[PDB]
Design a protein around this ligand. Structure first.
Ligand SMILES: [Cl-]
Ligand SMILES: [Cl-]
Ligand SMILES: [Cl-]
Ligand SMILES: [Cl-]
Ligand SMILES: [Cl-]
Ligand SMILES: [Cl-]
Ligand SMILES: [Cl-]
Ligand SMILES: [Cl-]
Ligand SMILES: [Cl-]
Length: 263
């Protein structure tokens, strides 16, 4: 009988494999691995996972020392109970893994730990240091609206703006008299990307990554969608487009960068 536990190791993947060669990866309904799980692969052939797609939440696909469990998503209505129930389907054993569903609007770190605890398996979790987080911190600043607008027209960068923030729209309409307010891209000398709080933060970031244009923005979702600074930071990790991020005050810069680079 295995002793259930969650050991956060600092050792390399190859040394961690000396205790156990078994890897627990997480995939969506179509058999697509989540980023964190893909970082534990070292050239293994993952064709076996695509073959039987689509899958049911809770399905377990095995091949060699790799075990893939299909987990639910909050985007589709998943809950911690549903997440925990899916991991219990994984055969009790010793596995090297990562915390599941840690993306934007995904499961929180504690919800992920909760699911692994209810599982009677022994897990060796490796750190998932944020991609390009060391580069995103250099774009963190604390500028007022006037400074952000000036930088955007002086540099021709796209500036995402939440239409639900009346004070911001009033400033933009007084400076750029006659500017056509409309949801989406608006471009006349200065270019903006207007969005509402009814549009999911994960959707707004997906559209910005699609445009892939240099940005000047505020933490997307912060205050607007009810997100606090830590929650908006978790979503901004997904922003791949180059961007200058402005926080409400300079003391929030060190705090924000902190959330942007944690494991
Ligand atoms: Cl993801
Ligand atoms: Cl199965
Ligand atoms: Cl085997
Ligand atoms: Cl948490
Ligand atoms: Cl990085
Ligand atoms: Cl470092
Ligand atoms: Cl558009
Ligand atoms: Cl669109
Ligand atoms: Cl706050």
């Amino acid at each position: 009988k295995i002793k259930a536990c969650i050991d956060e190791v600092t050792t390399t993947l190859e040394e961690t494999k000396f205790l156990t060669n078994k890897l627990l990866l997480f995939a969506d309904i179509n058999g697509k691995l989540y980023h964190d799980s893909q970082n534990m692969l070292r050239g293994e052939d993952m064709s076996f996972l695509e073959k039987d797609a689509p899958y049911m939440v809770g399905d377990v696909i095995t091949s060699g020392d790799i075990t893939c469990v299909v987990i639910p998503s909050k985007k589709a209505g998943g809950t911690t109970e549903m997440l925990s129930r899916a991991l219990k389907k994984v055969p009790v054993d010793e596995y090297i893994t990562t915390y599941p569903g840690q993306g934007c609007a995904g499961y929180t770190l504690e919800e992920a730990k909760t699911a692994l605890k209810k599982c009677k398996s022994a897990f060796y979790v490796l750190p998932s240091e944020a991609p390009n987080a060391k580069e995103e911190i250099l774009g963190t600043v604390s500028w007022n609206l006037r400074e952000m607008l000036a930088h955007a027209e002086e540099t021709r960068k796209l500036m995402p703006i939440c239409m639900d923030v009346r004070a911001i729209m009033a400033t933009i309409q007084r400076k750029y008299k006659g500017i056509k307010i409309q949801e989406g891209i608006v471009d006349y000398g200065v270019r903006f990307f207007f969005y509402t709080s009814k549009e999911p933060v994960a959707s707004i970031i997906t559209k910005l990554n699609s445009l892939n244009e240099p940005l000047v923005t505020m933490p997307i979702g912060y205050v607007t969608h009810g997100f606090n600074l830590e929650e908006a930071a978790r979503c901004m990790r997904s922003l791949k487009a180059p961007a200058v991020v402005s926080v409400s005050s300079p003391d929030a810069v060190t705090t924000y960068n902190g959330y942007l680079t944690s494991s």
